[PDB]
Symmetry: D2
Subunit: 344 residues, 4 copies
């Protein structure tokens, strides 16, 4: 056999360090213990191992948050920023996020406009399961709107209009006669108070003094309603400058920050950019489906953010490459939900 | 019934024939050929004259842009301005080939910064710690020295001072669109997309203008000279009006996110765009708007039911200059 | 008409209820719930008794595996055997819950090597030059020291000698399936998938068995002891026969490539599989077979027209142990 | 303004080295020069820059191949391995590959079974354009098979059967009476000789003594035909061991190797594993759409192959993340097709 060939393939190797963890999956001959099954993801490899690392990172930021020490929310030992794209509020992850907000487990929310309005609309009418392959022409003819494999009847938006128009009237009157300078976070707090329904994420956020930022709040159905309303009752102004001040000072005056970001886009960048103002987040977990090759911010690995100063150089950020509708409930089950006693 | 056949290089390298053969090559090459046809259709419609009835309806805008037979919305993600696609977009704006621009904050600031300092080529693998120690920021396989932002601060802070003054003394109600026009006028540089946009009366929408370096500067400036207000409501009125009073609309959308949905949503106000070409790398399986196929937008009324939208699944830095070569650039004489 | 609703953690951490709620959560969580239902349907059908007529048709195989009411084909890519999913697959084979296995060469050799030396956790970012200098091979975020392959060579070379002898002296016509059964018998280790496969008469198909370390060893051995023949024609006959004489078939396919097409093509011989669950990360846009949706296979007759196939778009290292927990592992008592 | 904040965002930077290339796209004010347009991809960024690097890598392997110096193919100064997945032969890239083989510009082909049979079937009947969204039930009812957005009538396979069965008879007879030990490469050479049509990739490959490897040749329509034929005329054996010997010795005895791989799977690994036998390829270009996160070989970056010894440590491998149906014709236009004079 050719000597160079044998030397290439049968190269000698170095011994790995003794802390080296061996690959091994869960053994179902033990039966089905769901806690042991989830723990075994950490030694299974590929994204299962990243999930295991994400559990560890989240548990670290919770433990730090539970250490004793233009906002009335009290400082804790670690401020947790939670960001999520709109479509995740269309999904049942809405319930997962509501739970975290209800029990004051996170401190700052960031979402796009759909992620605001659809939480409110779900208190008036439900969203239904469908399929991705349904054809647009047939859905349009029957007054049904598709979001992935979910379906929202047009009627839902008519109900939202009827609910929202009197509130927009009051907001204009308060602006003009009580001096209120409206921003997205202030409007979202008001809407959560008005929906007055404990299934709503934003009801709990305003009850618990958790601010919600959404700088492009007009890009959605709420924007449509504001548009039509402005010809009936002109005058509403929505400033985004004050809200930049508010989010950035949440980071600047924190003892510690952690970021948990579901998806990409504005929600990811806006949280990360706030944490640059303190020379970076202490903890960071990304769960998203985007890839780096197209140079996008959405698809950028956590290590790109280290180069900017958005994540501290000493941090151990983790990305899980998966649909958050699969992963986030499992993550919550092994982290926040295990510490519910401590949060109350 | 068209047969699959690729370009035969025994014919020699005849570039125009090679590009034409994408249409019969299959997979995304065929979608590229269909995108060329759709964009040439937008352009042909744009060049048709307005009848007397049509010239009445459209004219209801008080837009000082001349009105045409097809309003073209161009949307692009911040990173594409970091790329050399900035030059591709500047060309289209310089020659009035598009009517409305939508981009995120990075897509505005990095055009201006490129007039002050250049962006450099690097690699995706470069480690963050080493780059941070040297003040080098990474954008994919591109590199922006932090000094670039230091020069931006020196140039912008005086303009922010004037804007606050004009607001408090002349009653100016600032919006992202108005600010972008002002910054384009101030850069006074023919390499800038926003210089040409303001010169040609092409409006630029960016509802989350605070999400980037421009935000950092406004934040810092707020401490020395407070009061700047940026209203997003008036800009919603403006973008929606551009679609409502159009005879025909076309959408050319590079990437996903806010830029894609905001253009599509404006076109829902007229019961849908007539033409639509998407070029993005996102996939539908996660339920995202970014990854949604054009047919999802048909269910909402954002694209007309009888339109023939096309999506090309590819990095726009490869596809978009070839698309422009085969469409707008072939009709340059018409736009002058 | 089912309403979207996620699991409510105010109920506490009730794992079975949490997994059940994926079905109404949306996007790929819902596809996971539909995959659970489809696999439970395969299992229910498998446990139904054969009638007298049915027990005649099926029995035409000379397979010594007992025949059941649903033949389940399990396919998986090499990398999943490098992962801890190896343990998941071993469980199913050990308890006779699947009937036919299809994997690539890596999926065979790495199971055997794991009985000699372990694979370790690492990270995708590790640089190749540094790893090569230390004789460490990278498989994604996993690490295999080259010494692992040195031990494999010592263990396999004597078996290759016997196989060539049996071919030349006893007329044995070797095929990938026959070789894999032999290697499983030789490893004699209850942690190995192929030890259990040979013990339970579960055939293993791998038409490109030469594409990996097993190939390297056969190549080197060929110089000292020439003549080994591995016929792939007989194995084609064998896999196709398993589908033709089945009362019902189901396909569970982890990943893409040869493993996906070869199972689907065997099922075309019976005018399509009755049940089908795909779990892979590939996308359709490039025209690949890996990325093709199940509905593409319906056009060929590889999946029956009235089947309800499901694809879950996810890394199988996350999804497959949860799927097994909610399906096969709940019926363990039936398979003993 | 907070001092730490200003220090975080307005950090001082180091000067880049003077060889640093500036980002700039093609300027259409120059008009439309397609050669200048393609050259400008190298300074455009993201995958356009990777395309520019791929042009350079391919031109380097061609230049080395053109230097003066169980196979009758003569050694050149650099052996070029070309691999491609089956679906690319269904596409019009079939013509691109044919051109390279026709003019002896590459030395070794590797493809899966579909990439063999569909080149032959296209000489009997064409493939047609369709759409990805066409429904399987309606296509099946009309006897049409879908490949991505392409369509192949069932009739095509009936024509292939009629053409192929007499050839399989002769192969069995030659095995049994002339001692021929059939392998995939030998069968593919014979099929290319029999199709006798200069539109066929494999006609040119056998005319020019370019071997074709396909170790899972049974996974396709050719396998179906071999299966049905074996009950009418039993006996055919197809050995894969001899073909492993043949591909690996192409690498071992090369002066220099380059790999150009379109897609992933068996085709990618099999070429790379052959080049491990010489301690790695000198040049490597990957064009594929797969991603690394799932631990797949398909999605692995070139740097993973450096760790195995499949790519030399001193090499400068490139991956372009794109559909090869877009990129490969452009790549060929700027590399092989510019040097056609030298190849004749
Ligand atoms: N429900 C809707 O989708 C909806 C409704 C109203 C308005 N809009 C508007 O559309 C715009 C764009 O939406 P966006 O900014 O929220 O993001 P997006 O949904 O458009 O996608 C951003 C990126 O997030 C990642 N991502 C998305 N969903 C994911 C998931 N389930 N798991 C993992 N990663 C995931 C993907 O990589 C995607 O490319 C917003 O301004 C929003 O207000 C959308
Ligand atoms: N240079 C920067 O990326 C930069 C700079 C400053 C601020 N930001 C902020 O980041 C936020 C998110 O950025 P964004 O919304 O502009 O987009 P993004 O980077 O989040 O991209 C959104 C989606 O567009 C698609 N896309 C991106 N690049 C593409 C390409 N090359 N070809 C095809 N499709 C492509 C991808 O599917 C991606 O998931 C914005 O608010 C923005 O201001 C980014
Ligand atoms: N460990 C190894 O990867 C290894 C070892 C030796 C030889 N090889 C050889 O490499 C060749 C190619 O490998 P292959 O065909 O087994 O597959 P592959 O690695 O080429 O994967 C094929 C496709 O399957 C899907 N897939 C992969 N991993 C997945 C996951 N974790 N979850 C979901 N989907 C996933 C992806 O879409 C991928 O593109 C084979 O001939 C094989 O023997 C590989
Ligand atoms: N035409 C067909 O698709 C066809 C026909 C007959 C049989 N088969 C059989 O199916 C099996 C699997 O096919 P395969 O191994 O060729 O690969 P594949 O098409 O199944 O995919 C392998 C990977 O290659 C990459 N890829 C595929 N097409 C690409 C493209 N256009 N551009 C860039 N990257 C691309 C993707 O990352 C994909 O995951 C083979 O054994 C083959 O014989 C398929």
């Amino acid at each position: 056999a050719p000597a160079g060939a044998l030397a290439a393939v049968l190269k000698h190797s170095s011994t790995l360090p003794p802390e080296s963890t061996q690959v091994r999956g869960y053994d179902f001959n033990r039966g089905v213990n769901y806690r042991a099954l989830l723990e075994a993801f950490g030694t299974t490899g590929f994204q299962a191992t990243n999930f295991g690392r994400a559990v560890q990172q989240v548990n670290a930021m919770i433990e730090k948050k539970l250490e004793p020490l233009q906002s009335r929310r009290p400082l804790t030992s670690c401020t947790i920023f939670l960001g999520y794209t709109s479509n995740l509020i269309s999904s049942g992850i809405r319930e997962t996020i509501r739970y975290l907000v209800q029990h004051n487990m996170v401190d700052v929310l960031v979402t796009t406009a759909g992620g605001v309005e659809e939480d409110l609309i779900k208190c008036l009418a439900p969203t239904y399961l469908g399929e991705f392959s349904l054809r647009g022409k047939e859905l349009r003819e029957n007054g049904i709107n598709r979001i992935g494999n979910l379906l929202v009847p047009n009627e839902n938006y008519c109900k939202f209009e009827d609910w929202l128009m009197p509130i927009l009237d009051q907001m204009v009157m308060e602006q003009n006669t009580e001096g209120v300078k409206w921003t997205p976070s202030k409007m979202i707090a008001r809407l959560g108070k008005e929906i007055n329904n404990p299934e709503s994420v934003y009801y709990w956020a305003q009850k618990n003094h958790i601010p919600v930022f959404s700088p492009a709040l007009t890009d959605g159905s709420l924007g449509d309603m504001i548009f039509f309303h402005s010809y009936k009752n002109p005058g509403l102004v929505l400033d985004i400058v004050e809200d930049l001040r508010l989010i950035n000072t949440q980071a600047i005056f924190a003892k510690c920050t952690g970021m948990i970001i579901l998806g990409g886009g504005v929600v990811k960048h806006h949280i990360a950019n706030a944490n640059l103002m303190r020379n970076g987040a202490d903890y960071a977990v990304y769960i998203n489906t985007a890839q780096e090759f197209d140079g996008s911010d959405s698809g950028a690995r956590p290590d790109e953010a280290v180069s900017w100063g958005x994540i501290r150089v000493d941090a151990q950020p983790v990305k899980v490459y998966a649909d958050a509708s699969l992963v986030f409930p499992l993550l919550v089950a092994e982290t926040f939900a295990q510490k519910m006693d401590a949060f109350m």
